[PDB]
Design an enzyme around this catalytic site. Structure first.
Site, PDB file in Angstrom:
ATOM      1  N   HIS A 107      -4.961   5.991   1.005  1.00 13.27           N
ATOM      2  CA  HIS A 107      -4.108   4.827   0.799  1.00 13.27           C
ATOM      3  C   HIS A 107      -4.562   3.974  -0.377  1.00 13.27           C
ATOM      4  O   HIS A 107      -5.755   3.773  -0.601  1.00 13.27           O
ATOM      5  CB  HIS A 107      -4.073   3.943   2.042  1.00 13.27           C
ATOM      6  CG  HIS A 107      -3.609   4.640   3.282  1.00 13.27           C
ATOM      7  ND1 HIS A 107      -2.716   4.076   4.166  1.00 13.27           N
ATOM      8  CD2 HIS A 107      -3.922   5.855   3.788  1.00 13.27           C
ATOM      9  CE1 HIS A 107      -2.497   4.912   5.162  1.00 13.27           C
ATOM     10  NE2 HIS A 107      -3.216   5.999   4.957  1.00 13.27           N
TER      11      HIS A 107
ATOM     12  N   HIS B  21       0.813  -1.211   0.000  1.00 11.10           N
ATOM     13  CA  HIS B  21       0.000   0.000   0.000  1.00 11.10           C
ATOM     14  C   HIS B  21       0.852   1.270   0.000  1.00 11.10           C
ATOM     15  O   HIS B  21       2.012   1.260   0.412  1.00 11.10           O
ATOM     16  CB  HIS B  21      -0.959  -0.003   1.199  1.00 11.10           C
ATOM     17  CG  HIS B  21      -0.390   0.618   2.442  1.00 11.10           C
ATOM     18  ND1 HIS B  21      -0.789   1.850   2.917  1.00 11.10           N
ATOM     19  CD2 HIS B  21       0.549   0.170   3.308  1.00 11.10           C
ATOM     20  CE1 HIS B  21      -0.120   2.133   4.022  1.00 11.10           C
ATOM     21  NE2 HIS B  21       0.699   1.130   4.279  1.00 11.10           N
TER      22      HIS B  21
ATOM     23  N   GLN C 143      -6.941  -1.365   9.155  1.00 12.38           N
ATOM     24  CA  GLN C 143      -8.269  -0.755   9.100  1.00 12.38           C
ATOM     25  C   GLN C 143      -9.233  -1.615   8.285  1.00 12.38           C
ATOM     26  O   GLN C 143      -8.822  -2.340   7.379  1.00 12.38           O
ATOM     27  CB  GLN C 143      -8.197   0.661   8.516  1.00 12.38           C
ATOM     28  CG  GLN C 143      -7.294   0.785   7.300  1.00 12.38           C
ATOM     29  CD  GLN C 143      -6.492   2.073   7.299  1.00 12.38           C
ATOM     30  OE1 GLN C 143      -6.469   2.806   8.288  1.00 12.38           O
ATOM     31  NE2 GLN C 143      -5.829   2.356   6.184  1.00 12.38           N
TER      32      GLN C 143
ATOM     33  N   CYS D  27       4.150   6.604   5.192  1.00 11.70           N
ATOM     34  CA  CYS D  27       4.053   5.674   6.309  1.00 11.70           C
ATOM     35  C   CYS D  27       5.339   4.868   6.457  1.00 11.70           C
ATOM     36  O   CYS D  27       6.222   4.927   5.602  1.00 11.70           O
ATOM     37  CB  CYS D  27       2.869   4.727   6.100  1.00 11.70           C
ATOM     38  SG  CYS D  27       2.098   4.153   7.633  1.00 11.70           S
TER      39      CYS D  27
ATOM     40  N   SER E 115      -5.473   8.115   8.548  1.00 15.75           N
ATOM     41  CA  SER E 115      -4.177   8.649   8.141  1.00 15.75           C
ATOM     42  C   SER E 115      -4.294   9.525   6.894  1.00 15.75           C
ATOM     43  O   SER E 115      -3.668  10.581   6.811  1.00 15.75           O
ATOM     44  CB  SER E 115      -3.191   7.509   7.886  1.00 15.75           C
ATOM     45  OG  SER E 115      -3.865   6.338   7.455  1.00 15.75           O
TER      46      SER E 115
END
EC number: 5.2.1.8
Length: 114
Positions: free
Chosen positions: A108, A10, A82, A64, A105
């Site tokens: 993604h 990701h 998630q 990230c 966040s």
């Protein structure tokens, strides 16, 4: 088919409206939906074009900690990431990519490896 664990990659791209515009990569994210999707989208194009690779891209753009594995978070088990992540990830085929996913966040994009 949906096992108890699978491998996926990701690309995290937080934004100015993110719950926390800051990560191991930066501490002051002021990129809006425009700059946000602009990055993810651009990454998607290059990949589908055969010029770049989500792996190489994600790394150079992974806000990230995933950048370590260039986005690839190895094989995980349901209930770890998630909800939208697991679903999209577990819903994608071998070598597939999930569209812009808006989460705590930010935005993604995931892909199924295993």
């Amino acid at each position: 088919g949906e096992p108890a664990r699978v491998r996926c990659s990701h690309l995290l791209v937080k934004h100015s409206q993110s719950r926390r515009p800051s990560s191991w990569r930066q501490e002051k994210i002021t990129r809006t939906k425009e700059e946000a999707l602009e990055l993810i989208n651009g990454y998607i194009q290059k990949i589908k074009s055969g010029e770049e690779d989500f792996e190489s891209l994600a790394s150079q753009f992974s806000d990230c900690s995933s950048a370590k594995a260039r986005g690839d978070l190895g094989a995980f088990s349901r209930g770890q990431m998630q909800k939208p992540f697991e679903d999209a990830s577990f819903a994608l085929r071998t070598g597939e990519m999930s569209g812009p996913v808006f989460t705590d966040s930010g935005i993604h994009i995931i892909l199924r490896t295993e």
